[PDB]
Assembly symmetry: D3
Homo-oligomer: 233 residues x 6
Amino acid sequence: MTPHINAKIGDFYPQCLLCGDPLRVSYIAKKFLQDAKEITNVRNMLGFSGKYKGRGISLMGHGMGIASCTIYVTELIKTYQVKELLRIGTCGAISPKVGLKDIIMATGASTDSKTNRVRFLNHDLSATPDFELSLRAYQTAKRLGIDLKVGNVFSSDFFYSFETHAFDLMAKYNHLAIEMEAAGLYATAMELNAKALCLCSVSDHLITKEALSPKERVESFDNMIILALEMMS
Amino acid sequence: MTPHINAKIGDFYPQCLLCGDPLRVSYIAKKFLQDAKEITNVRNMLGFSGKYKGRGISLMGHGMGIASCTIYVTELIKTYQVKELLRIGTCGAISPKVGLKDIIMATGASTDSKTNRVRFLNHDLSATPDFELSLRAYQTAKRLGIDLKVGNVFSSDFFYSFETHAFDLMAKYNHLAIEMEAAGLYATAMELNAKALCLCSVSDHLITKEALSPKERVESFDNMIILALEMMS
Amino acid sequence: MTPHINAKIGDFYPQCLLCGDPLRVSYIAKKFLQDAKEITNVRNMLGFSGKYKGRGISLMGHGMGIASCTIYVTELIKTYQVKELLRIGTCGAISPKVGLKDIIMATGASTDSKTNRVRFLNHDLSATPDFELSLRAYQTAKRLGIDLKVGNVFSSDFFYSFETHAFDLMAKYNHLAIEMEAAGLYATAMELNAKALCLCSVSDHLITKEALSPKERVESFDNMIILALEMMS
Amino acid sequence: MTPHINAKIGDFYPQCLLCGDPLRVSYIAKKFLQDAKEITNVRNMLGFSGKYKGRGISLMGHGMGIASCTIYVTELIKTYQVKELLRIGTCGAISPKVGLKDIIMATGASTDSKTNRVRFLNHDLSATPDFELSLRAYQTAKRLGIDLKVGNVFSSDFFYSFETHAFDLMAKYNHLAIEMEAAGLYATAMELNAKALCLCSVSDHLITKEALSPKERVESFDNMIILALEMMS
Amino acid sequence: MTPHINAKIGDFYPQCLLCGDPLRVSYIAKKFLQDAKEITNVRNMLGFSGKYKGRGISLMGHGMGIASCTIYVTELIKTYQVKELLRIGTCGAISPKVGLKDIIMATGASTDSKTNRVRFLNHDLSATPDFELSLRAYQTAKRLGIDLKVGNVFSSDFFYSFETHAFDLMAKYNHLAIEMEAAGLYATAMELNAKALCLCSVSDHLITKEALSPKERVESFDNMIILALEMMS
Amino acid sequence: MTPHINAKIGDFYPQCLLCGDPLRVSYIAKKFLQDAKEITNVRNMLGFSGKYKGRGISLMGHGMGIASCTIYVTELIKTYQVKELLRIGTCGAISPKVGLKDIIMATGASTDSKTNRVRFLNHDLSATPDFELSLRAYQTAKRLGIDLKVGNVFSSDFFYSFETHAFDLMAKYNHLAIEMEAAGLYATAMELNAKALCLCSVSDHLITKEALSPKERVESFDNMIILALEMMS
Ligand SMILES: Clc1nc(SCc2ccccc2)c2[nH]cnc2n1
Ligand SMILES: Clc1nc(SCc2ccccc2)c2[nH]cnc2n1
Ligand SMILES: Clc1nc(SCc2ccccc2)c2[nH]cnc2n1
């Protein structure tokens, strides 16, 4: 066991879906998995293992922000032997190319965090997902007829940004939305030689000023959840 | 009313005790408060309002990491009108000046985060608590017979550090322990003109490798809890 | 029409293949294109327009280094209306996952340059290629029987590195090879909403010290050239 | 002896008051100490030892700026065995919370200097005073009926700032005034395990545009001087 | 031989003139040198050796940007034994002190590159030329009656700057013009204990909006070329 | 008229000689000037005006450190209309190219300070002297039979360095000696369009550990003083 996960070694399948919200994770387990079992619950951060269309898959909450996400992903890889990590989170749209509830695949995660400079020689680590997972997401979305939006996200240490004046510049450089964990997921999976990808659905729109309720952030994104389950089967 | 808290405006008392672990918040509510009511539970991050010696006291979990802590503290101040925020938690000791079950009061929080540079003109923000609250902590601790250890902590973006070789230098510069949120708590409270303080309990020494027993950990944390509840009376 | 290119507006096809060495551009024009016409030669940096399997294709040299590459790519997009830019070249391998005559597709370009910090709010820009172009490269490579190696490259301001001790850490974080322009190609193309990609051929392994023979180098580079010309068809 | 102090070892008492201006130091010796002796004068930087209410106390000039202050404080601690260092300087008010000639106690010293990044792993050192000295200053001011203003100061390498547009932001983050040495005093005393505190009286007001003459900067601050002498007795 | 120069050891004279444009180098060889021989041509980057007034002198192209220039200068010094390197390039005027086609001697080369921080402890390397070469240029210009403008240049990684709003500030700090290689020439020659100087003629004026054609950038600067040849004889 | 200088406007001649030590300024006034009058003494930082060979010459102390030097130099230029500023002092040699009683002329001043980044867009300012003044120094030194050693110095915020292991790298890059103000003198004078230069005398070699005798130190410094006074004639 680890300080933040109280499952047994082997309780996790090698493929794991992730959300920051452990209640979205619980929602997915109850609605979409067969024979789902809760396998961890330290700090109320739930994780589960179950089956989708006969294939074992795990689910795990990763909390909010790069530091939190790095903790759980690090332990999932090094202790629990997880090989493929698919984040399915929420994000704030800053580009006019996307609308509320669109699903974005993050081809790269820019950041205002210092974590990657600390990791990577004080240089610019371009944090990126595994290409095969990215390809699988693209192909599965096409097979399902889901309009997958593809581009960079900006992973911030701030939900309440001090730099909103810079969002248009971010969008000009192909950042479709802002969230807070992808760059940490990506850099941890690069560190540890694991396969990771980040999808996020648009829960807030900074141009149109739209925002979903907390309940809607759990329940409104079945399309992104089903996309994730299909690509992992 | 916010994406991360679903309490009604007015549910929070203006004095709030915070922990990273929402189950520790739950423990405090059930064991130490009278008439405790759960008031928020988005993302399983529990908060409560109750009374201690007739005085209204709120409790809120804030998760792991500066970014997570900054979300909750910002919303508590700006939406729920919280005025005093007392963070309690455990911390890994790195200084020979502290030992097991010591309680540290952080009069400064250094960091490897980029957040305060983003907040503060790319310069060095000295992240400090409210002085009156620190004085209140010192006077209450003396009246309870607690020998408070006072110094800096180091707030890291990394639980699994890449710089363990630097702990000794940290200790030389009067950093007694490492944790992961104090600098964000303090910078947010300075931004927003609120009173904040961080106390942390030594259950593990990262240098000597000494660790408390599980019943000593419960006992040590209860002493902290009482110190915190007494200074909010 | 620009200080560095003396072609007439309209001389460039909207799809352009790029190399750092203008003599390699010349080699490609004479060996692989039909009706090739030299269209620019300022500073001896040659560019050409010709046809491959009836399709119009342009070629342009860009010199060595992010700053040099950014000049040419900017002018090609903004003045000559180039829309797709495929960079091919050699790169020094640093990862045990690649070997001699492997072809790498860079889905991210890290850097020791300050350019992307200057472009991007002093934060970390994740410099990434156009996803559709990368997918086109992967599908074309499979149809030609090429096993494309996909990962990051590190774009350095230094040919003669002062940080050779850091190559292993670079490789750990999924940097397969080092070159000197991809991060600038990618950042310029994101700035200007153009589609860009970088492929590089392994003729030298900087770790194992293995090197191709001069006829193997020609042979390896021709395979790249054909892959590039086929994806622009 | 040291390059910058020509006193004998043992000439300094373990408690020392500091000013940047050696003529304020001389003023204090003549007006407030019994049997004051000049004990050092290299570079015209005067230092003294004498008695206040029967208790031995020393005085020393530290010149202007972090670099200058670091030199004298370093030598006072390592060669002359000084244990408690109380800076009593001047500062420029940037916050509407304070007026001309108010006395500020610096709970922390933010800075635009690079010295603490050079000292502290290129991270953010939150430079802070010794808590017991801070407490003593608070209690002595109360006993004397002095209205001690308490908060952060910003220690700058610039008296003539290039960033006056940022002063309101500084004040929002609880920086009451700007001066040029506290962060260096604090970081040197943290380095060397000594007790330090910075008090400063407001000699310039950046909101009301007030400014004292050079003579007034020596002679107008008896209240802060007497506060210092009382807390050290 | 080196990867970027295919001359024999000894083909270069110890004194070498440099331009970024290998066609300006070729122009000088044909128009001004006796018995000029082309001695290198990798990547179309021409170099020559010939005689001026009986004295052997070499010429070499260095391409565009600090990274490119660093490659050729490094190899010229370490392999080809070049002792004195005189850059005679072009630049964009940002100061009202100079006009189109003025000749500037760069007493120092500021930069937005990270290369010197990577070279020099992450501190500020003030990149400067050899004083004796500077003196020789001053004296030769006086003997020839050429009005040599003297001050700093700013060496940028950007020809198309994202910071034009800062050019007036640059000019205030005695930066007469902007170019892209001097800081790299200067830092490489400091690294390797060689003598270097940068002269540049104004080919673009950012205040008056003037700009020369590509042909004029080769042919309009005989005065700077003859100055260079005279100081090296 | 300023917080740090109490001379009357007009008391300063437009040519000023500067030293960090005000007692050295005093020494020069009494030994080398005619009709010397003390004109300022705030903080014991003495300044004088007198004549040398009938020419009016001012002297001013500037203290230790870039921040201290910048205060005095700014006030001298902006309030007292000083136009030429010649700094003389001692410096610790770090290069094998210089030895005891050599005099160095600093044609560049590197630094570990953040001041020039704050002044100059967060980029690298190459801090350089006025060229005409440097030429005047070189011509006067030759006429007096002095073999001036010309190169960079390193201006540090630290007298007691934390980076002594880096002195050799400093020396490699043509830093002949270390001192603590030249970069600030030079940056202030470039900001304000004044002519400045720094000469420093080698009385200590920080590598070889050789040191002058106290009478050799007086003798060496007098030779400097005469060189300075002669170039201001
Ligand atoms: Cl950093 C980030 N920002 C947002 S919207 C920020 C936002 C804040 C205030 C007002 C409007 C919008 C997110 N929505 C889901 N994940 C997210 N991550
Ligand atoms: Cl950095 C600093 N600034 C000031 S007022 C700066 C100031 C400069 C120009 C005009 C008005 C005010 C101080 N007064 C006493 N100590 C101090 N330290
Ligand atoms: Cl960085 C640099 N910039 C310029 S003018 C830039 C410029 C760009 C766009 C429009 C007007 C001017 C140069 N001219 C010769 N060398 C040079 N180096």
